[PDB]
């Protein structure tokens, strides 16, 4: 919609489009249109500084990014003070912005210090768990972190995101996440069995399908999953792979119960 109607539009409404257009462009990954949409936003607004900082980080202009982050903080002081005066509940929205700005600061020191990566990942994992369990905040935070980390490099965060989506009536989004975690679309290739790499993803996918109408298919798939797990456990037993074994056994139990509960 944004692409279709750009020259057919007035400047006043162009300004209001710019933010959503830039957000969509960032989400898709087309960096050409993101700059065009960003340059239209006023420079005095918090969002303008935020998006200019994002672009600067993408283009490795760290000093400019720091300047933009500082300016964004100065622009945020007013809203935070206004809302903080009454109750902590009303101030949460700005607290999320403060969280995002600090995470953006920490994004630098990830492109410069290779010896400081695992600690940053652990810190991110521990901090994300103290926030509220809304979906949009998680979406924003994960989008911010996605500048240097791909989903395949940290599975548990995305698995928890998919599980959170599941308990809400948004099963399609969880389907998309699990599809982009498996690497293929088992929905298209019905005649084929599920892939066996990353068993946790397969387990989560089977219970999402059970959440939908495909109950008997889920049961049939789970039986084969258990058979394959037992065969793999027997054929790949080694003293080195004991922790693995311990994590394998703990998985099989969780499978078995489900079977019975479904039977």
């Amino acid at each position: 919609q944004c692409c279709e109607k750009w020259t057919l539009v007035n400047d006043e409404t162009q300004a209001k489009m710019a933010r959503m257009a830039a957000a969509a462009a960032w989400g898709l990954g087309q960096w050409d249109s993101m700059e065009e949409y960003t340059c239209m936003i006023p420079r005095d607004t918090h969002d303008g500084a935020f998006y200019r900082a994002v672009l600067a980080l993408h283009q490795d202009l760290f000093s400019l990014a720091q300047q933009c982050i500082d300016k964004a903080r100065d622009l945020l002081d007013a809203e935070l003070t206004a809302m903080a005066g009454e109750s902590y509940s009303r101030a949460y929205g700005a607290m999320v912005s403060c969280h995002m700005l600090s995470e953006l600061e920490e994004v630098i020191q990830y492109k410069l210090v290779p010896e400081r990566r695992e600690i940053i990942r652990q810190i991110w994992w521990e901090r994300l768990q103290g926030c509220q369990r809304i979906v949009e905040d998680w979406q924003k935070i994960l989008m911010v972190r996605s500048l240097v980390v791909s989903p395949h490099e940290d599975m548990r965060t995305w698995l928890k995101y998919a599980s959170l989506c599941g308990k809400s009536g948004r099963l399609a989004l969880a389907h998309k996440t699990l599809v982009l975690l498996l690497g293929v679309d088992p929905s298209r290739q019905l005649d084929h069995p599920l892939p066996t790499v990353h068993p946790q993803v397969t387990y989560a996918y089977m219970k999402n399908m059970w959440k939908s109408a495909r109950k008997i298919d889920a049961f049939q798939h789970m039986q084969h999953f258990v058979q394959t797990m037992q065969q793999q456990a027997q054929h790949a037993i080694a003293t080195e792979d004991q922790q693995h074994k311990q994590e394998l056994h703990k998985l099989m139990a969780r499978c078995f119960l489900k079977l019975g509960e479904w039977q």
Partner: protein, 740 residues
């Protein structure tokens, strides 16, 4: 404290004056108060220049908010009513410096001064100065009263005087700028009414103000080159009147000429022809007259800026004058006009020779640099001539040599004999100015720095620079020579004879050369660790002694600063010594001078950065200490540095969410700072810390943590007696009781 300060401020009363003011500011920074106020009274009543200096300098240096205003307001009010001019300039500067304090009295003070200035409008000029100073220093409360301002200035302006006009037009300019940022018809009406010599040079400046504010583009050229609806509607009438006045009054009447020269280019920039040939005639006629020769070229250049495609016809005339004026060496503006002309390449070639025949003069090299900037083409001939003239100057008066050394580093150039000539130069030199500039030029000209040719020359020259930088009897060029060595020099500073000299440089007296040398050596030691490492270990041992075994408040602070620098640079030497150092620093914090605490807190943050996941187990105590300091302003350390160090700890070590549970008041504290202070840095640091700790779920926050009631069904007769008793008993508990 009493007599010494009195003597110092008397010497101030009786270049040198500015140095004395700076020295007084430094002495106050080191710091009696009653004697200082008595001294201010002593010098005020009597001389006035030093009193103004003393009064003005201390403002913005000490922490006086209200009593200082209450005392100095009378001093400033006594002088303005009746007094001689000129000296007022400094009193006005003092007023401006005072007015930027802003402690709950600016509105009253400024309105009082403005009203008393309007009353007068040695009396009128004082009011003009007061209005101008209040407009500059206080845009807010000056904007409060505008109609009386305009009405009374329109009366006082048109008196037969020049001094009162020169300030009235400036006050009008300030008021109109403030009005535009957030009257014009009245201004134009009263300006045109008078014209129908006294009622010329003020009306012209007022119309200039209106025209300039109408289009800021022309003034954005005027200002830049100097350093090197309403009017539009009534455009035809004003243009016709101005043209008639110019054509008719050819020799009717200095001041009018400068006003005309000021107006012509801005008017042309408003609309680039109608009277171009006429403007050419006026300006050129004004040139040959010495009293107007300086301003005539200003007008010519400004009009060349305004009018673009019609000035070229008169290139031969102006140039004919220029080549005649310089051979003897007014042209200071000629060069600005020539530079503005390009904003045209073959005439500059011929113009090259006499500009360089001028010798060394200010604004020439900058003019050439800007010319090369806008039009990239002819430069090699410029460089050749410049180098030849510089050589002729340096083979053989003092300020000329200084300017030559300054010029020898500007823009590109195309040098073996020159370096050795400079070696002779700074050697024949008992002068803080010649030597400093020569050393700067030598440092800049050796920018290139793997081939073993010119390496020997670099070695010899660098040896000489180090010798001078370490042996200078005075301190001010040692600091410049040392600082001139940046990160680029690593190959030659890794030698032995140079490292020994650098070591000698350490343990100096000024403490600034000490910081610079320790920073430099710390930057080194990644290339020649054989020599630097033991020396730094020894210096670390010495630093930990001074701080531990000396009961003095100055050396401890200096040593803490030197430890902070050492930790920041060369961090591979500190990792095995983390536990001892920390244990020492904490001891200084656990004691029943603010600088010592500030430096200790500052260095703890750098210690935190250099480590992490190894400073855990030490976070709880440092968290208790800094929290105790954050509240409880009895131990009033700074807050910016404390918040900075807290954030550094949390970020580096990794400590999230748990602090909220362990210290339930950490959130109620951090938000309060947002509604109580007026510092950008403090607020930004608080926001950064809130971000680093992470957003917390409101439910988790919850987990972590009568008169109307009297009105029931009681009759009114019984209600009145009670509430009265409740209120009285509420008062009846100490405090206010003091007088009640």
């Amino acid at each position: 404290s009493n007599v010494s300060v009195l003597q110092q401020f008397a010497s101030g009363l009786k270049r040198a004056k500015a140095a004395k003011e700076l020295q007084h500011y430094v002495t106050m920074e080191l710091r009696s108060t009653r004697f200082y106020d008595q001294l201010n009274h002593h010098i005020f009543e009597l001389e006035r220049k030093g009193g103004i200096l003393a009064i003005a300098s201390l403002i913005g240096v000490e922490g006086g908010n209200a009593t200082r205003i209450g005392r100095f307001a009378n001093y400033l009010r006594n002088l303005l009513p009746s007094n001689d001019p000129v000296v007022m300039e400094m009193a006005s500067k003092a007023i401006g410096r005072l007015a930027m304090a802003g402690d709950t009295f600016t509105a009253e003070y400024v309105e009082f001064e403005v009203k008393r200035a309007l009353e007068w409008l040695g009396r009128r000029h004082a009011a003009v100065l007061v209005l101008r100073e209040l407009a500059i220093s206080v845009p807010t409360f000056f904007f409060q009263q505008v109609q009386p301002f305009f009405d009374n200035i329109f009366v006082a302006v048109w008196d037969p005087k020049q001094a009162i006009r020169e300030g009235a037009v400036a006050a009008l300019r300030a008021c109109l700028i403030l009005t535009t940022q957030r009257w014009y018809r009245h201004t134009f009406e009263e300006a045109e009414k008078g014209f129908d010599d006294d009622r010329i040079h003020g009306a012209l400046l007022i119309l200039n103000e209106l025209v300039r504010i109408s289009s800021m583009e022309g003034e954005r050229l005027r200002e830049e080159m100097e350093e090197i609806l309403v009017e539009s509607r009534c455009c035809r009438d004003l243009m016709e009147e101005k043209f008639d006045q110019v054509c008719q009054w050819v020799l009717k009447c200095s001041l009018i000429q400068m006003t005309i020269l000021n107006l012509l280019p801005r008017l042309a920039a408003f609309r680039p022809t109608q009277y171009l040939q006429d403007t050419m005639n006026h300006v050129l006629s004004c040139v040959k007259k010495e009293k107007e020769r300086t301003a005539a070229f200003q007008a010519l250049g400004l009009l060349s800026v305004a009018v673009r495609s019609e000035f070229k016809v008169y290139l031969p005339r102006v140039l004919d004058i220029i080549r005649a004026a310089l051979p003897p060496k007014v042209d200071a503006t000629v060069f600005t006009c020539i530079s503005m002309l390009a904003r045209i390449q073959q005439d500059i070639k011929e113009l090259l020779e006499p500009m360089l025949a001028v010798g060394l003069s200010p604004a020439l090299t900058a003019v050439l640099y800007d010319l090369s900037r806008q039009i990239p083409q002819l430069k090699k001939d410029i460089q050749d001539g410049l180098l030849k003239m510089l050589s002729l100057v340096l083979m053989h008066d003092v300020g000329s040599i200084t300017l030559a050394l300054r010029t020898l580093g500007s823009f590109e150039f195309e040098l073996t004999q020159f370096v050795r000539h400079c070696a002779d130069h700074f050697l024949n030199s008992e002068h803080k100015e010649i030597r400093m500039e020569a050393a700067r030029t030598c440092s800049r000209l050796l920018t290139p720095s793997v081939s073993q040719t010119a390496v020997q020359v670099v070695a010899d020259v660098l040896s000489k620079l180090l010798v001078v930088g370490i042996t200078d009897p005075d301190p001010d060029i040692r600091y410049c020579v040392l600082a001139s060595l940046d990160e680029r020099f690593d190959a030659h500073l890794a030698q032995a004879e140079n490292l020994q000299a650098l070591f000698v440089a350490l343990n100096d007296q000024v403490f600034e050369i000490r910081e610079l040398a320790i920073c430099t050596v710390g930057r080194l030691s990644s290339m020649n660790p054989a020599f630097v490492m033991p020396f730094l270990r020894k210096m670390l041992i010495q630093i930990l002694t001074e701080l531990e075994h000396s009961g003095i408040g100055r050396i401890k602070e200096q040593s803490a600063r030197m430890l902070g620098h050492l930790v920041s640079n060369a961090p591979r030497l500190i990792r095995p010594y983390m536990e001892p150092i920390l244990k020492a620093l904490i001891l200084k914090l656990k004691d029943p001078n603010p600088g010592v605490i500030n430096n200790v807190l500052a260095t703890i943050g750098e210690l935190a950065q250099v480590s992490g996941l190894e400073m855990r187990k030490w976070v709880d105590e440092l968290f208790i200490i800094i929290m105790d300091m954050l509240q409880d302003s009895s131990l009033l350390a700074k807050r910016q540095v404390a918040l900075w160090t807290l954030g550094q700890l949390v970020a580096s070590t990794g400590y999230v969410v748990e602090p909220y549970r362990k210290y339930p008041t950490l959130l109620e504290v951090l938000l309060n700072f947002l509604k109580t202070e007026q510092n950008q840095g403090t607020r930004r640091e608080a926001i950064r810390v809130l971000g680093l700790l992470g957003a917390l779920d409101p439910y988790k926050h919850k987990v972590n943590i009568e008169m109307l009631v009297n009105m029931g069904n009681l009759p009114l007769d019984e209600f009145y007696p009670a509430v009265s008793m409740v209120a009285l008993m509420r008062i009846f508990r100490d405090q206010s009781l003091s007088h009640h």
